[PDB]
Amino acid sequence: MPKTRRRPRRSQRKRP
RNA sequence: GGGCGCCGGUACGCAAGUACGACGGUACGCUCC
């Protein structure tokens, strides 16, 4: 499995 | 191009990491023309 991330899949990121 | 996974680079760091909707994708692994 690849490295563990935090900021999600772009689609989610609404309000800056 | 976009999705899902994820990442760059931004924090933090000794450098790689681990954070992180800093703010930018979709590269690279699959999927749809």
UniProtKB/Swiss-Prot annotation:
Inducing factors: Down-regulated by P30II.
Note: HTLV-1 lineages are divided in four clades, A (Cosmopolitan), B (Central African group), C (Melanesian group) and D (New Central African group).
Main function: Rex escorts unspliced gag-pro-pol and singly spliced env mRNAs out of the nucleus of infected cells. These mRNAs carry a recognition sequence called Rex responsive element (RxRE or XRE) located at the 3' region of the long terminal repeat (LTR). This function is essential since most HTLV proteins are translated from unspliced or partially spliced pre-mRNAs that cannot exit the nucleus by the pathway used by fully processed cellular mRNAs. Rex itself is translated from a fully spliced mRNA that probably readily exits the nucleus.
Positions of short motif Nuclear localization signal, and RNA-binding (RxRE): 2-16
Post-translational modification: Phosphorylated.
Self-association and partners: Homomultimer. Multimeric assembly is essential for activity and involves XPO1. Binds to human XPO1 and KPNB1. Interacts (via N-terminal nuclear localization signal) with human NPM1.
Domain statement: The RNA-binding motif binds to the RxRE, a complex secondary structure consisting of four stem loops and a long stretch of stem structure, present in incompletely spliced viral pre-mRNAs. This region also contains the NLS which mediates nuclear localization. These overlapping functions prevent Rex bound to RxRE from undesirable return to the nucleus. When Rex binds the RxRE, the NLS becomes masked while the NES remains accessible. The leucine-rich NES mediates binding to human XPO1.
Protein's UniProt name: Protein Rex
Full-length numbering of the shown residues: 1 to 16 of 189
Residue spans of biased composition, Basic residues class: 1-16
Family the entry assigns: Belongs to the deltaretrovirus Rex protein family.
Species annotation: Human T-cell leukemia virus 1 (isolate Caribbea HS-35 subtype A)
